[PDB]
Symmetry: D2
Subunit: 210 residues, 4 copies
């Protein structure tokens, strides 16, 4: 069904995600696991990046190596919970430019509310990685993509922890070219827009807010 979805299949991700799902897992551990899983999802999510051959001189001899255009990578957390994922991916892409997009989803209305967007310069060359752990209805990530495109972004990859089918479908309907990398695809949403079985409220579980 889901042309643009990659569900990353790795035993360590399964392991770690299951601990996150567990309601007894507190915020220190929940954050650690989120960072760690993002590091593994990063493997798959960045596999597409382009290399240029470049000469290198080693201590022994000259040879031909490889280079990515490093400043051309843009990492964009959706606040708050995407912050922790951004920390993870920046361990792998430490010379990326970073944007921040503040959106929350209104609990009652289930619409996205934008409160901040500060982005580095964007153009056709820029590879953007947008990060938000829970892709539920999709309204938040769609809004963030809207803001990215508006500001010149072309190539955008979404990295999430868990998606629901309707969220993935929503993103595909609007933005057919956006690839989505996740640790799991769950079953559906409950009446309050939470992913089932999911893991509850990610922001609250990360930061101990109520």
């Amino acid at each position: 069904h889901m042309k643009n979805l990659v569900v990353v299949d790795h035993p360590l991700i399964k392991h770690k995600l299951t601990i996150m799902r567990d309601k007894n897992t507190g915020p220190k551990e929940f954050r650690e696991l989120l960072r760690e899983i993002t590091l593994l999802l990063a493997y798959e999510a960045t596999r597409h990046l382009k290399c240029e051959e470049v000469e290198v001189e080693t201590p022994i001899t000259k040879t031909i190596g490889y280079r990515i255009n490093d400043k051309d990578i843009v990492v964009v957390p959706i606040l708050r919970a995407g912050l922790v994922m951004a920390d993870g991916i920046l361990e792998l892409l430490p010379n990326a430019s970073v944007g921040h997009i503040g959106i929350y989803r209104d609990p009652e209305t289930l619409q996205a509310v934008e409160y901040y967007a500060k982005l580095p310069p964007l153009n056709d060359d820029k590879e953007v990685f947008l990060l938000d752990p829970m892709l539920a209805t999709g309204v938040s990530s769609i809004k963030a993509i809207e803001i990215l495109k508006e500001n010149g972004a072309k190539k955008i990859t979404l990295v999430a922890l868990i998606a629901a089918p309707e969220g993935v479908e929503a993103v595909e309907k609007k933005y057919e070219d956006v690839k989505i990398y996740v640790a799991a695809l769950d079953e559906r949403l409950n009446d309050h827009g939470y992913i089932i079985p999911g893991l509850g409220d990610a922001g609250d579980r990360l930061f101990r807010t109520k």
Copy 2:
């Protein structure tokens, strides 16, 4: 090379190329080694077995997955394997850790153990053995020897760069050991360094001569 996996990822190639570069100092070199090890870890741990287990999420009960976490063993070869171990332990924080010190003689091409301190090993244990430079292979073959002497069965070798001779030597002796690397280089020079390689890994990590 039946047992060799050369991990092909653009981020690994990028980072490895900076490590190769003679101008890259110790602080960066270490960072890059740890970062590459995190990526090589993906591929090197793909084989680990899951058990299904019940979990209750805040929403509902469901079926999740679990690895026997204490049954993983991480074993750096001193010194330069230390930085790799730091990397992999980010991903496998509940592993037991062993340490092995081997001196390789350049003149005779023989290896001897100077230290080995291991956690309990048995058939169930998944051992990851870490050394950046797999050159002649004698060091990793000695470390595998020690591991097997102490009860290890399943051993996976993770390295940064290998030379063909080192890979062959390991496969001749220990045909079941899988080897994950960032690169397979061309050959060794008259002093047993990998070409083009990256020089002396330990010295470049810690700024020793």
Copy 3:
């Protein structure tokens, strides 16, 4: 003249801060150094925290040890640049609750307004650490303290990298009980509200935005 100000005097902080100040220092290194300085400033900023005696059994024998009320610590970055400080402090206080505050400061009117604030439960018992690297006019941190107090915060400690006299003075005028820990006190503000000699625009230098 500055009752509530602690300028932390340590050769490593001076060293690292000098590197941040240097205009050639790129975003990767600037972030690193900010986190590392925050770790050292943490030493002094948390020295006041109260211990309870508790029994502990070690593998050899029982003894009396010490404990802090860990979940009663609250870390609050001011977005964006406080985010990197928060990562630093959370390495030492990983069981803290985390709040996030977004304040716009208007350059033309000198007024500050909240655009986001998401806080964990606050009360008299909670030890709050509020983090923002550049304490210039002071209006941003004063608005954040206002919001904290509004939501029940009592004990609040400000941690910054560099402050200007006017900022310190402004905080002391409003909130006489807030202690302020910094790596340096600089000379003054320029016509555009930047600290001299300071280090430029901290957010932009951390994230490579313009």
Copy 4:
């Protein structure tokens, strides 16, 4: 009345140390705490380092800053347990040279056995930081100091987690110029050379060895 001993008094160190002492604390957490305590002990152990004034140009203006001779710092773990400490201090001193000294203490004879020493160049200018968590009889650290001095080291600082009085005294008797920074001074040694109340076997508890 131990002239060269500094017991670092900080409520976060006491908090963290108490968790390490607790026999139920597993290897993952034990390692994190040892690295975190070392960061705090680093504050006090490096306070003495010497600054040179240097010019820096910030994006705003030229000013006078500070600089330490960074490559002139040497970090030396005693294997194995010292490794985790070195990892912590290297977070603050990332440009330091690193030596390794392999010594274990024979459980039966309580004598130090050296199996490895690989050191960067040493001279009178070099500031050496020697790290080993448990300073019990002193034999290990005395042997390591011996090796350092033999190779040209002059200024040496010992950082440990817990010391026993007899170990501190033994170091003072031999090397009266070596300062020792620790998180705690415990009471005495038992019959097998373990610190009471201490925390058991540091190497085993870090790495899950028997």
